[PDB]
Amino acid sequence: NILKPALSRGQLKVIGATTNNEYRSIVEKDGAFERRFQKIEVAEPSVRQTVAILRGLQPKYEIHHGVRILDSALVTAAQLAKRYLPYRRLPDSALDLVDISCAGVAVARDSK
Amino acid sequence: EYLSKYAIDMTEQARQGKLDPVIGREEEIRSTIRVLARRIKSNPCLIGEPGIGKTAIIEGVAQRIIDDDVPTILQGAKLFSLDLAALTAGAKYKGDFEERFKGVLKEIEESKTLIVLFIDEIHMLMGNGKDDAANILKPALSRGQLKVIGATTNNEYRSIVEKDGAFERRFQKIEVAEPSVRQTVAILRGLQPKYEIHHGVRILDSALVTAAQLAKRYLPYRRLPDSALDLVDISCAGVAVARDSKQNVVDSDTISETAARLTGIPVKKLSESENEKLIHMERDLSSEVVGQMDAIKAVSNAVRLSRSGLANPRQPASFLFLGLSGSGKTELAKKVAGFLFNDEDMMIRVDCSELSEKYAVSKLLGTTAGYVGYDEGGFLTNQLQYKPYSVLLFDEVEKAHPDVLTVMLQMLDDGRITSGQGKTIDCSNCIVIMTSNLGAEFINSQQGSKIQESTKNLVMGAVRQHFRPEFLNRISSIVIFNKLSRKAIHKIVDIRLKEIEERFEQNDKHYKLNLTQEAKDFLAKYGYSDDMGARPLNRLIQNEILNKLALRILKNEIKDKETVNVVLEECLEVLPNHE
Amino acid sequence: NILKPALSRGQLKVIGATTNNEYRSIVEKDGAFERRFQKIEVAEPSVRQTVAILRGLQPKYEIHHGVRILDSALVTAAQLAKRYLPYRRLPDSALDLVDISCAGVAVARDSKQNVVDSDTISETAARLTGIPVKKLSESENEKLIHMERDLSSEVVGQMDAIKAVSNAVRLSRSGLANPRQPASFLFLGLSGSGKTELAKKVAGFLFNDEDMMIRVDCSELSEKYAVSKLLGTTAGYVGYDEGGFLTNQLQYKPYSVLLFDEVEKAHPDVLTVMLQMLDDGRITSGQGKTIDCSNCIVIMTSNLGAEFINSQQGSKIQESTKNLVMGAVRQHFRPEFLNRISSIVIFNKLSRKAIHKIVDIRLKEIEERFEQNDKHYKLNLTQEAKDFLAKYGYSDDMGARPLNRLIQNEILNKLALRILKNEIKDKETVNVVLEECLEVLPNHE
Amino acid sequence: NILKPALSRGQLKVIGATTNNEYRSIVEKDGAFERRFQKIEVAEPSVRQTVAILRGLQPKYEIHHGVRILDSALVTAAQLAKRYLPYRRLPDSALDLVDISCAGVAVARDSKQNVVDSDTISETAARLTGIPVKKLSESENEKLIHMERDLSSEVVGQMDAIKAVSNAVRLSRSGLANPRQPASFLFLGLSGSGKTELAKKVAGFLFNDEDMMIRVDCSELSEKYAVSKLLGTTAGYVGYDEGGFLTNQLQYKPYSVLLFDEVEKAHPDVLTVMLQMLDDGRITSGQGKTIDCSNCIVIMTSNLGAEFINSQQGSKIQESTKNLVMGAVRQHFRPEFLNRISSIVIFNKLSRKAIHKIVDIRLKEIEERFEQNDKHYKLNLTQEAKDFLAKYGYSDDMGARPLNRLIQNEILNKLALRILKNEIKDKETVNVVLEECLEVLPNHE
Numbered sequence A: 001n002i003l004k005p006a007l008s009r010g011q012l013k014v015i016g017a018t019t020n021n022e023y024r025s026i027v028e029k030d031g032a033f034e035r036r037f038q039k040i041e042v043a044e045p046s047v048r049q050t051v052a053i054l055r056g057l058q059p060k061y062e063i064h065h066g067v068r069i070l071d072s073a074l075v076t077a078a079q080l081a082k083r084y085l086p087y088r089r090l091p092d093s094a095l096d097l098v099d100i101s102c103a104g105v106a107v108a109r110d111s112k
Numbered sequence B: 001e002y003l004s005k006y007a008i009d010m011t012e013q014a015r016q017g018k019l020d021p022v023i024g025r026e027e028e029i030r031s032t033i034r035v036l037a038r039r040i041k042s043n044p045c046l047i048g049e050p051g052i053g054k055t056a057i058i059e060g061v062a063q064r065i066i067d068d069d070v071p072t073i074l075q076g077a078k079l080f081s082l083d084l085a086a087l088t089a090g091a092k093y094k095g096d097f098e099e100r101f102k103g104v105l106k107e108i109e110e111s112k113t114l115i116v117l118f119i120d121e122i123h124m125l126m127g128n129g130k131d132d133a134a135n136i137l138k139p140a141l142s143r144g145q146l147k148v149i150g151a152t153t154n155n156e157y158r159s160i161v162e163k164d165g166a167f168e169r170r171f172q173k174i175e176v177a178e179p180s181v182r183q184t185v186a187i188l189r190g191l192q193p194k195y196e197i198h199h200g201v202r203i204l205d206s207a208l209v210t211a212a213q214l215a216k217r218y219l220p221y222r223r224l225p226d227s228a229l230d231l232v233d234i235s236c237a238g239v240a241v242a243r244d245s246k247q248n249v250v251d252s253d254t255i256s257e258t259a260a261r262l263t264g265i266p267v268k269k270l271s272e273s274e275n276e277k278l279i280h281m282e283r284d285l286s287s288e289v290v291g292q293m294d295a296i297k298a299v300s301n302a303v304r305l306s307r308s309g310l311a312n313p314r315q316p317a318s319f320l321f322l323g324l325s326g327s328g329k330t331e332l333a334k335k336v337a338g339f340l341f342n343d344e345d346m347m348i349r350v351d352c353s354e355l356s357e358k359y360a361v362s363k364l365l366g367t368t369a370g371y372v373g374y375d376e377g378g379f380l381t382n383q384l385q386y387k388p389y390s391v392l393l394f395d396e397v398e399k400a401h402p403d404v405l406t407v408m409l410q411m412l413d414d415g416r417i418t419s420g421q422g423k424t425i426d427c428s429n430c431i432v433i434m435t436s437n438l439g440a441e442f443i444n445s446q447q448g449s450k451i452q453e454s455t456k457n458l459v460m461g462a463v464r465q466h467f468r469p470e471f472l473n474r475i476s477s478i479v480i481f482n483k484l485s486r487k488a489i490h491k492i493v494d495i496r497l498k499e500i501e502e503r504f505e506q507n508d509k510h511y512k513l514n515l516t517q518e519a520k521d522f523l524a525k526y527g528y529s530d531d532m533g534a535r536p537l538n539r540l541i542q543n544e545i546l547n548k549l550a551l552r553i554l555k556n557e558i559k560d561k562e563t564v565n566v567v568l569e570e571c572l573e574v575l576p577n578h579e
Numbered sequence C, D: 001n002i003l004k005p006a007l008s009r010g011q012l013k014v015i016g017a018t019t020n021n022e023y024r025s026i027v028e029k030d031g032a033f034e035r036r037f038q039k040i041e042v043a044e045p046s047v048r049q050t051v052a053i054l055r056g057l058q059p060k061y062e063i064h065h066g067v068r069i070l071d072s073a074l075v076t077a078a079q080l081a082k083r084y085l086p087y088r089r090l091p092d093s094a095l096d097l098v099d100i101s102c103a104g105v106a107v108a109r110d111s112k113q114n115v116v117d118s119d120t121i122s123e124t125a126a127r128l129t130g131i132p133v134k135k136l137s138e139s140e141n142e143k144l145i146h147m148e149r150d151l152s153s154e155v156v157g158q159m160d161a162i163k164a165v166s167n168a169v170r171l172s173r174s175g176l177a178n179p180r181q182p183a184s185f186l187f188l189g190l191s192g193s194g195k196t197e198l199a200k201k202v203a204g205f206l207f208n209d210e211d212m213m214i215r216v217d218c219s220e221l222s223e224k225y226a227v228s229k230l231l232g233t234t235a236g237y238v239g240y241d242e243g244g245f246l247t248n249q250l251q252y253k254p255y256s257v258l259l260f261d262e263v264e265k266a267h268p269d270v271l272t273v274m275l276q277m278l279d280d281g282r283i284t285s286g287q288g289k290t291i292d293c294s295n296c297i298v299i300m301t302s303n304l305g306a307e308f309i310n311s312q313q314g315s316k317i318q319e320s321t322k323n324l325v326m327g328a329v330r331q332h333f334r335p336e337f338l339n340r341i342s343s344i345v346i347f348n349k350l351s352r353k354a355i356h357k358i359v360d361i362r363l364k365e366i367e368e369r370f371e372q373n374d375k376h377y378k379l380n381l382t383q384e385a386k387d388f389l390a391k392y393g394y395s396d397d398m399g400a401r402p403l404n405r406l407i408q409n410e411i412l413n414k415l416a417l418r419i420l421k422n423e424i425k426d427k428e429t430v431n432v433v434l435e436e437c438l439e440v441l442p443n444h445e
Ligand SMILES: Nc1ncnc2c1ncn2[C@@H]1O[C@H](COP(=O)(O)OP(=O)(O)OP(=O)(O)O)[C@@H](O)[C@H]1O
Pocket: B020, B021, B022, B023, B024, B025, B049, B050, B051, B052, B053, B054, B055, B056, B057, B059, B120, B151, B152, B153, B187, B225, B226, B229
């Protein structure tokens, strides 16, 4: 790890990521990393934003599973997830409902 | 450089500005510095209550440090805000945070100019059983430079030093306190451009003043810097919304509506509709209060004094309602609340027949330390903390035990009502009413329905026999509730039936109410005794008229314009159908 | 136990050091410690020794601070420390006064000679202890000398009470006051006599603050419970933060004025508590701690004398009548209590002339009380209004208190109406029916 | 498997060793060790046995230190250890005294050899435990012989109390006092007669410090709290601050004076506890420890007898008059208590003759207690000031209390004012008219 600070003057640009909880641990454990990295907060999207994300990925799921998705379904996934999946952040929770649901359709369809 | 992983370099921030101006704290700063300039025990503390500038002082000294407005010793010193993760980063493995604390002190102790720490919350270190439990890691070196400015409230302070015993022999307490109202304004003024910039609005200088004065006379549980600043910031946010909606903080309206929203207290809102406000109330009350204009005016007068600020800030207006039993004075207290708050049920009341020397004071203000039950505030302050301005009512106060009666003097003047746990409530814009039937003996002289001169003194006599002069001479007004006699009760009955109609569920059936002498007399003959007063006028109206007609309504025998008449004690009303 | 077997073989000579109660928590939770070490008690040095210690350390401080310390300074610190810093042992307390005083010199120099003396220290001590005596502000002796007139400008007559208090203050300022005996008074007389008012004005005078006072309302007492309201309870019983009325105030403001209202109503066990306070000042606290309130001034009030003062045998109470007042006192309080009162003072009944003067002062206070300089009187009837108030408020058994009520009811309510109806703007005047009333100064101004 | 399966087979013969507390924390949790180890009780030996042990070890100490030890010294140590070191088991305790005593000689040896006799051992015990009686301070016999004199110069009158206490002190010092019965007194008398004054002066004499006294305000003791206030709470309750006021003092100052202020007010539950403390001495703590108070002097005070002393029937209390007092003490306290007091002493009335002497003492103490011990009196009027105070301060039924107050009222109050006005440096003087008053120093200071 010492190679990083040691050589870090020569650009050697690094992009990384960490959980809010982990960032705390990174900072406390190393110190230099806080001084070397620019912390960036990344926001959780609103339901409206989440749906826009889902729409972008909608064709990936439709193609992957061979099923269609109603636009209101994407809205529902994001909205429903916000209300009933408080333990999972929307970028994932909404997709979990979309992907699981698509599979449920394909799964039943492609059963015996 | 462990310090850089845990602390904020206040000096660097000051070097870069990005700090609020510091106003009026020069002496706290001078004291802080003077202690820091000491040969050995250079460990001052900023102590008081939250929201009194304790961290402002630090931003202040950080700026004085940047500009070399400090003693030789501090000229080149730097300051760091630590606490935080210094005690929690070591979430695992014994001795880990302890190592950090030590490493930090080592970093500070050796060579690198004079470094001063700022502990925002010394009580967080506490010394949890000593035995290396954080705070205890310091004392060994409190002489070895490692200068530090601490900070704590008095409760926190007292808790620490009482449990520790060494810190109070190592640290120099500096009293930090809320500013005077004018000093508060200067502070608000200093932060004025901060709020104006972030909200994009202006703040009138008079709004700063209003917030400062208001806070002093409005929020007893919040110290002036925060209290007045919150009135300013909260107001600025409201203005920013107006700005965005399509401005400035208006001394009168932004702050008053904000305050009215936050707490209430009608006085702090003061409606502009002067042609009717504080005028019409007498007419409204007159309808409820037939004949007894004397009580209405007594109340209205106090209400008028509280509005526009003539009333004394430490003297809740208060009345003693003496009179003929059944006079209706309790309802008056509610009807007054009706006008005052547009809420007849705003009040807090106590049944005084429940009071005894053995418990009454605690039933009212709560028990004290070490005793069972922490229903702090009992019947009263328990509720004042939510509605500081509500009307207070003491039912049959004449039956209250004299000791609790004496406690009630606090409501009447020098408004520092306290709680059993040693806390202060502070009442001002709060109208208080106590009730008694002593005047009944003189009213029953029937020398005019209106109590007369001399006879009212006989009433005062009866009052002195039951109430100490210490109580009586501090009442805004002692009001006597007069005989209603036949003329008022004829009006009361006509009115009660009307007022009931307006509130008798829904206006589906409607009334004629042609009582004629028959029903006017029934209600006025088998009802209004001088010693039952109006109580039976309402009870006969409900027990005989509203009830019998209601039963006919339930049978669907009534569709339109209900009437009233008698059988001719056998009268009993007994009303016909109206299908 | 790494040291344990080692020490048992006479190896590793170890020198320990700790606090009396820390030791207790060690040895009584270990046993082996008591076997391993030989405790040696370390004495607290006497004042005389303390001075010798300070003297021995003096050059270290002089060098550090760059100041000269005079011998009287050393003495002063040791003396003041024993008397005014009861919660800190002499080796530190005396040094704290020297060290801080020296720091004060260093600060003073850098804030803009360097010889530390008795006054240097006394002022410093006052800043640290709050004891006003040690400010030694002799140019203010005018107030201390004339505090009797100053008190008489707020309260009327009752000169014996004023003089009695004045001497408590003067004795304290002179340093002559007995270092262990808080000033103590028992104020006797009619309600409305000014007993409480005086105490407020004393607090006023001494600290420019009537709320400086620590009030204890004896009517809330019960011998079955209430002792704990003042001193708290002991370890074990529910609750702690002990002694909200006395312990938790006296450890912060030793120089404050205590007021015990209506001590005759106190149940006997509380009156018993007062005995510590009124003697030595070593008031104990429920958690086993002491207060040592010798710097305090204590005023107690009682209406037992109402029985004889309302004999009306002269406005200024005479012998026999006064002795009957003492009769009531002696028949109520145990002598053990009475013998601890520095002075038992019987207030005079107010004279009509006093009432006149009181009305003037009281009106002055009311006018001064307003936060809005519209709210004032000119009165007119410059004597007549006041005579009305006296004639209709001069109570031989309520004293001046009715003057307050009379004014509030006959003058201020009329003002309230006048404000409400905008009949008065400012400079209000008074007139009389047959029944005092006010004149109208309407929206003309 | 630390040891266990092997021990269970007769393998690894293991000899264990532990205390009862340790045993309990091991065995009650482990179970198996209760059977793996075969418990053998080892009793603490007798003094005779201890001495035999000391004799056997004597040569190890003599050789190490290069000293010679007398057999009587060894006996002395064992006896002293049993009596003065109750917190340390006898074998150790006896050795500590011998070893340390020898060390005493050894320290001197390097700076100057000797032998260790009984006197040396005794000094050592005092060095470690205070217990002044073992200092064998024979050169101080003068004080013990004349302590009555010294106390009589502090306290006028109360000769019976002084003699009674003096004897407690002498018996303790002479080694005649019973190791299980701390001397105890109950002082009955008028307030102001000097009950607590004597007690403080005794602590003064004994330790050169009145503050050494373990004062307990026993009057502030309601049933439910009172015992724990003094002994502390037991395991399982809020505040495990064992000892409250007594254990926490007794364990550190075993040779101290205890003072109980107004025991008549203490709830009987308190007195019930004190019964053991006063006789036998094994007061125990709330946590289950035995303290042992027997090296203390206990003074208890009360005012029941005031009701009869006020009859004026003798200065020295007369027969019958004393019985009225004893009647009251028997009516109020259980005989179980009264019987355990070493002596009940009824104080004399402070007669006018006494007040003449008391005035002198108080005037001197007033000067002595000044912080600013510069501003002394000259008084003048030796006979007239003395007489004024003697007459006006003679409120016989209030004891000397009124006198103190009189001096305060007539002299110090005025003095304080004169000081604020800078009218006095020192050598203050008194005049009288007819009313005692103070003069000024024309030269302000
Ligand atoms: N001159 C000032 N400089 C900075 N802040 C000030 C000043 N005057 C008042 N304040 C207010 O006080 C706050 C910090 O001051 P103060 O010490 O009163 O709070 P605090 O109680 O120290 O904070 P904490 O609860 O951490 O002790 C600021 O955030 C600001 O709102």
